[PDB]
Amino acid sequence: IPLPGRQSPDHARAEAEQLAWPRSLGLIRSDAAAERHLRGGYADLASRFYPHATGADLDLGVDLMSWHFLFDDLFDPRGEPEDTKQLTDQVAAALDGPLPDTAPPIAHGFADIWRRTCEGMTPAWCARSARHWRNYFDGYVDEAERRHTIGVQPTVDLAERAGRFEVPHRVFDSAVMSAMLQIAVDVNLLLNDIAHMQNEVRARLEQYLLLESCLPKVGEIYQLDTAEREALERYRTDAVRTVIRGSYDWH
Numbered sequence: 605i606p607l608p609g610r611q612s613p614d615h616a617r618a619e620a621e622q623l624a625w626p627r628s629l630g631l632i633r634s635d636a637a638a639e640r641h642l643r644g645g646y647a648d649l650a651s652r653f654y655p656h657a658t659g660a661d662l663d664l665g666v667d668l669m670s671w672h673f674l675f676d677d678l679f680d681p682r683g684e685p686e687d688t689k690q691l692t693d694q695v696a697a698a699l700d701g702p703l704p705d706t707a708p709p710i711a712h713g714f715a716d717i718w719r720r721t722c723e724g725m726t727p728a729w730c731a732r733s734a735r736h737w738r739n740y741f742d743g744y745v746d747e748a749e750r751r752h753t754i755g756v757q758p759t760v761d762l763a764e765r766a767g768r769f770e771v772p773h774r775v776f777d778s779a780v781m782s783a784m785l786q787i788a789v790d791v792n793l794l795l796n797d798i799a800h801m802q803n804e805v806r807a808r809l810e811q812y813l814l815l816e817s818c819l820p821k822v823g824e825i826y827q828l829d830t831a832e833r834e835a836l837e838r839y840r841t842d843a844v845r846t847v848i849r850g851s852y853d854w855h
């Protein structure tokens with residue numbers, strides 16, 4: 605992984621306060637569950653996925669890591685299709701509007717993350733981020749019956765929100781960026797299953813660099829102005845690179 609290791613300078617405060625949010629939302633209800641959460645290193649992981657984030661922006665990324673692992677654990681008999689989809693639909697419902705008070709705590713937790721994720725972003729970014737979540741939830745149903753259950757894309761999406769920028773949407777959809785994001789997903793997929801595959805990681809990372817060098821040309825093809833060029837650069841270094849490197853340094 606020829607990418608620099610990076611960690612937010614606010615990582616210590618974020619890790620110290622990481623329990624207040626899942627406790628106030630009923631996701632963690634016992635001191636033993638709290639300790640098990642602390643042992644995951646989830647704020648540490650967020651501080652590496654989002655080194656450019658501090659304060660409330662990094663707390664949102666910590667909550668997202670917190671929520672994902674609390675959520676994934678709910679499928680460790682339910683995870684063996686109908687019962688899986690019954691939970692996912694209740695969570696995914698938060699994307700379409702307010703949840704009923706009867707919704708399980710894990711769904712009110714996602715809704716609180718999603719509410720904070722969208723505020724201040726363009727509606728089109730929200731809609732696209734919402735589709736990524738549905739693909740994530742659909743992946744759990746498909747697994748019960750991997751590029752979607754890993755949840756790399758919503759992690760990447762949060763890096764944009766935590767950095768208060770948006771990569772130009774027409775470059776997000778580009779064949780080049782789509783190939784870069786696929787590498788990020790595959791690399792995260794291989795490193796997690798390990799925790800020949802190492803060669804596949806090395807080959808993909810070498811291809812990742814090749815794809816990175818096309819981005820100056822991609823920017824002109826889509827006629828990026830100055831701000832859009834800087835957003836694309838922030839996306840390359842603070843969202844894609846960080847989701848590739850941060851996962852490795854975490855393990």
Ligand SMILES: C/C(=C/COP(=O)(O)OP(=O)(O)O)CC/C=C(\C)CCC=C(CF)CF
Pocket residue numbers: 668669671672676740753754755756758759792796851
């Ligand atoms: C480490 C990792 C965990 C994802 O969980 P699993 O796919 O079930 O594997 P595991 O049982 O933990 O061995 C995969 C990569 C994680 C990320 C890219 C960030 C966490 C995932 C999110 C999805 F939404 C964060 F919200």
